[PDB]
Structure 1
Amino acid sequence: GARASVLSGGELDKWEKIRLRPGGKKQYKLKHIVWASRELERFAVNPGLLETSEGCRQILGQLQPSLQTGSEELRSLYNTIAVLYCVHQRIDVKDTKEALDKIEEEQNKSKKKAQQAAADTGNNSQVSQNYPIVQNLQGQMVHQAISPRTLNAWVKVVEEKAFSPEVIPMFSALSEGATPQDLNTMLNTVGGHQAAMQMLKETINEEAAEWDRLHPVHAGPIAPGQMREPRGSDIAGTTSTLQEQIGWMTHNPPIPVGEIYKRWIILGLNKIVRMYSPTSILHHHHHH
């Protein structure tokens, strides 16, 4: 009966401009909001948090876990707040589920910032660290690096058709079973599109993650000094050095460390080319 304070004029129009559950054919209302906030109070949480996007965040935040401990009804409550959060951010939504995906992106965005900070942390409780040391050992075999003559050759290749199906093979040829220091050098001298190179890095990096994902590392008490099993990251040169790389490559048995990384590049370049391809055709085929 008149009198209220939760959603704004336009903000409310957005809230109400969101269909509830699918198959219900119901639109959100201030009543649902009140009920939403009401549920919060029941959860022993400040209902005034729903009045603001900040408080809503704290809820939805501490609701994700309570969701798996809440119930079907409690879930709907969370879905209600989620949508509200979208209205706060003003994300293009239509249904409650849409908010989940919408708010999802936003969250992943925010959390990102946090992560970034945590990285270059500054104002927070820190702890000291130690610095161990061990005698340096000598590996085996010494592979030669890449020459500048080849780099130039590739450079010409890139300038020829950096992005193309006739370049993917050409590059792999000049990078035939190459290392990270070599492949990195070549990819360095490259020059076609940073954007393309960016995505390639994503596919490459993703290749390692996926590799390790499908690569179950279950090595017990390996021998002392033995050559453990390097993961996609290791092959990337993050957990392994060039020396260790070439070695792992020429190890017994020999592991396609460099080959794996090389294939990664081809993977990306493949997508890069598939993107800069001359009027490509559509295609699709899968098994259910």
Structure 2
Amino acid sequence: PIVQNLQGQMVHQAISPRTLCCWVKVVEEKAFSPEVIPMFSALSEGATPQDLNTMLNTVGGHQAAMQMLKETINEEAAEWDRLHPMREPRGSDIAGTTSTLQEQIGWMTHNPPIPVGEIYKRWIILGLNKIVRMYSPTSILDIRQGPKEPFRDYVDRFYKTLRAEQASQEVKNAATETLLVQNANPDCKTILKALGPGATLEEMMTACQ
């Protein structure tokens, strides 16, 4: 990654072991649960395209997803080239495949900077979103409380599904206002209507325990 020295100038640590080992552990354990994405962001502050590739190349298993992620990176690089045909970085320079660590550093610490790091990062995040959406056990079409299901379990699947579907804040708000109550089992749904409007999720969960 790139960091400024005490003197204020832009230099460069190599990716630290603590970072890598945390990243590796997290991807293993969580598979592609939606929280993997903000984790990836937080672990990759200031990363060069070379650090980003080390992160992708050290994930074990999930080769189907790593392969899709590679396709999405290819589609975004091609797209970058169409819109923007030392030297100027091509799409592949940004994904760090046809560029050197030295070139990458040049661009990132230039003034004004070309943050190839940040650009590659958005392509990776775009690929992760797709993979999180594919991997979710759950879907939009199926979100109703089971007849015997605790209200808390159902609320967990409801929000877990929203987060994975990458619902827009409007859609999330709509689903909270409507569905949550609408798709509850009849016992709970009845209790919930009695609370009347303006019921907090806290009040609703307390009412149905």
Whole-angstrom distance in 2 between the partners of 1:213 and 1:168? 28
Do residues 272 (structure 1) and 141 (structure 2) align? Answer: no
**1 or 2, which has the higher helix percentage?**
2
Runs (5+) with no aligned partner, structure 2: 1-8, 142-164, 168-209
What amino acid is aligned across from residue 120 of structure 2 in structure 1?
Y
Deviation at 1:214, TM superposition (A): 2.1
Q: Give yes or no for contact 1:246–1:258 (8 Å, CA) kept in 2.
A: no
**Correspondence for 1:259:** 118
Deviation at 1:278, TM superposition (A): 3.2
Give 3-state SS (helix, strand or coil) of 2:35's partner: coil
Give 3-state SS (helix, strand or coil) of 1:269's partner: helix
Which among 162, 169, 183 is matched to residue 52 of structure 2? 183
Larger Rg: 1
Residue correspondence of structure 1 range 22-171 to structure 2 within 5 A: 142-171=11-40
Q: Give yes or no for contact 1:154–1:174 (8 Å, CA) kept in 2.
A: yes
**Correspondence for 2:194:** none
Deviation at 1:192, TM superposition (A): 4.3
Using structure 2 for the length normalisation, give the TM-score. Answer: 0.59
Q: Give yes or no for contact 1:203–1:264 (8 Å, CA) kept in 2.
A: yes
**Correspondence for 2:62:** 193
Whole-angstrom distance in 2 between the partners of 1:267 and 1:149? 25
RMSD: 2.4
Whole-angstrom distance in 1 between the partners of 2:120 and 2:132? 18
Give 3-state SS (helix, strand or coil) of 2:47's partner: coil
**Correspondence for 1:59:** none
What CA deviation, in whole Å up to 9, does each residue of 1:98-154 have, x standing for no partner? xxxxxxxxxxxxxxxxxxxxxxxxxxxxxxxxxxxxxxxxxx964111012211111
Whole-angstrom distance in 1 between the partners of 2:124 and 2:91? 13
Which among 90, 93, 104 is matched to residue 231 of structure 1? 90
Whole-angstrom distance in 2 between the partners of 1:278 and 1:169? 20
User: How many residue pairs end up in the alignment?
Assistant: 136
Whole-angstrom distance in 1 between the partners of 2:111 and 2:64? 38
Whole-angstrom distance in 1 between the partners of 2:31 and 2:55? 12
**Correspondence for 1:242:** 101
Runs (5+) with no aligned partner, structure 1: 1-139, 218-226
What CA deviation, in whole Å up to 9, does each residue of 1:1-26 have, x standing for no partner? xxxxxxxxxxxxxxxxxxxxxxxxxx
RCO (CA 8 Å, sep 6+): is it higher in 1 or 2?
A: 2
Using structure 1 for the length normalisation, give the TM-score. Answer: 0.43
Which 4+ stretches in 1 moved above 3 angstroms?
none
Q: Give yes or no for contact 2:49–2:116 (8 Å, CA) kept in 1.
A: no
Q: Give yes or no for contact 1:158–1:192 (8 Å, CA) kept in 2.
A: no
Give 3-state SS (helix, strand or coil) of 1:144's partner: coil
